[PDB]
C-alpha cells in the first residue's frame, strides 16, 4: 500500500476524495492516509530508515529547502509530466500540491464587527478580544504583521523580522495559535479566537458543515503547498505514479471544487463549475499580496530561531 500524509481534517479528507480512487483504479494500489505533516516526524523517518510516508504534502517553502539538505528523493520527471504543472511550484524534489492564501475568517456572529484588513487585525481597541495565528514557523503571520504596520506589499522583502515582531508584540496576550487546520477550525466555530488568520480552505469546510464564517480577502497572502517524497520510501515507483496522478487536471480540478483551494494544473479551471472557480484564491486578486516561498527556502533556518525565540521572549 501507498501511504499519503497531509495536515488532516477536511482538507485531508478532500484530498482522499479527489485522489485515492482515480489511483486504486489505474495502478491497483491502495492508498492510506497517515499525518498530520510534521518536518520533525519527516526527518525522524527519514533518518531512521524507516520511511513510512510516501508522499507527503508540505509547505512549499519547506519542499524548496529540503532536497539538497537529503529528505527527499529526486522527483521522477519521466513520470511526471510538468508541462501542464504550475511552474511557480516545481523543483528537482517537489511539485505544486494546490494553492492557498491566508485570509481574515471570522464568527461574524460572536462579535461587533468582523476585521476586514490586517489593520484592524492588528487594532485590539477597536476589534477587542482573542485573535489566531498559525503556531509554526512559515510564510504568513510576518508578512501580515508588516503589512499591518503600513508596510506596501511589494516591499515586504527582504523582510524587517524586527519590525514584524514590535509590531506583533502590540497583541501578542491576546494571541491564541493554531498548530493546525482543525484547530484553526475549532477556534473560529467556537469563537474562543472569534477571527484571525486562517487557511481559505479551512472557512469553505466550516460552510460547507453548516457553520457560518464571514472571510476577509483583502490583502490575502497566497502560498502554495507541494508533494514531495521522503528519501528512502519503500515505494519510490508508486509514489511518483501518485504524484503524477493528483497533479493531474481532473485530479487537481476536482480537490479544487472539494475544498474551495486553487488547482496547480494549467488545465483544471475550465473543468470546473465557473461559480466555483471564480471563488478560488487564484481569482482573489483586487487586493492580494503572494508570499515568497523561495525566500523563506532560503532563509529557512534562520527565520524559524528567530521565529521561536520570539515566541518565547
Given at each position: 500500500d501507498l501511504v499519503f500524509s497531509s495536515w488532516g481534517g477536511t482538507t485531508q479528507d478532500a484530498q482522499k476524495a479527489a485522489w485515492a480512487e482515480k489511483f486504486m483504479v489505474e495502478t491497483g494500489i491502495n492508498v492510506l492516509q497517515d499525518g498530520p505533516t510534521d518536518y520533525g516526524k519527516l526527518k525522524a523517518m527519514v533518518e531512521a530508515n524507516g520511511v513510512t510516508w510516501d508522499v507527503v504534502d508540505v509547505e512549499g517553502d519547506y519542499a524548496a529547502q529540503a532536497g539538497p539538505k537529503g529528505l527527499l528523493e529526486k522527483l521522477d520527471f519521466s513520470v511526471i509530466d510538468k508541462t501542464k504543472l504550475d511552474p511557480r511550484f516545481v523543483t528537482d524534489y517537489s511539485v505544486g500540491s494546490f494553492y492557498y492564501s491566508f485570509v481574515i475568517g471570522c464568527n461574524v456572529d460572536s462579535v461587533s464587527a468582523c476585521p476586514k484588513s490586517w489593520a484592524d487585525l492588528f487594532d485590539t481597541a477597536k476589534?477587542?478580544?482573542?485573535?489566531?495565528?498559525?503556531?509554526?514557523?512559515?510564510?504568513?503571520?510576518?508578512?501580515?504583521?508588516?503589512?499591518?504596520?503600513?508596510?506596501t506589499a511589494d516591499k515586504l522583502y527582504p523582510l524587517d523580522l524586527d519590525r514584524a515582531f514590535k509590531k506583533l508584540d502590540t497583541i501578542k496576550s491576546d494571541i491564541i495559535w493554531w498548530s493546525g487546520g482543525a484547530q484553526s477550525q475549532q477556534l473560529i466555530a467556537s469563537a474562543e479566537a472569534p477571527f484571525g488568520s486562517v487557511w481559505n480552505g479551512r472557512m469553505t469546510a466550516l460552510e460547507q458543515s453548516g457553520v457560518k464564517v464571514e472571510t476577509s480577502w483583502a490583502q490575502n497572502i497566497t502560498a502554495a503547498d507541494s508533494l514531495v517524497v521522503p528519501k528512502g520510501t519503500k515505494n519510490k515507483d508508486a509514489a511518483m505514479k501518485f504524484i503524477a496522478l493528483a497533479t493531474s487536471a481532473q485530479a487537481q480540478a476536482d480537490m479544487a471544487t472539494a475544498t474551495g483551494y486553487a488547482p496547480v494544473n494549467i488545465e483544471s479551471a475550465k473543468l470546473m463549475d465557473p461559480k466555483i472557480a471564480k471563488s478560488l484564491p487564484d481569482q482573489q486578486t483586487e487586493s492580494q499580496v503572494n508570499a515568497d516561498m523561495n525566500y523563506w527556502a532560503q532563509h529557512r533556518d534562520e527565520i524559524g530561531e528567530r521565529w521561536y525565540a520570539w515566541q518565547a521572549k
Open positions: 476589534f477587542p478580544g482573542k485573535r489566531t495565528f498559525y503556531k509554526w514557523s512559515a510564510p504568513g503571520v510576518i508578512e501580515a504583521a508588516l503589512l499591518a504596520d503600513g508596510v
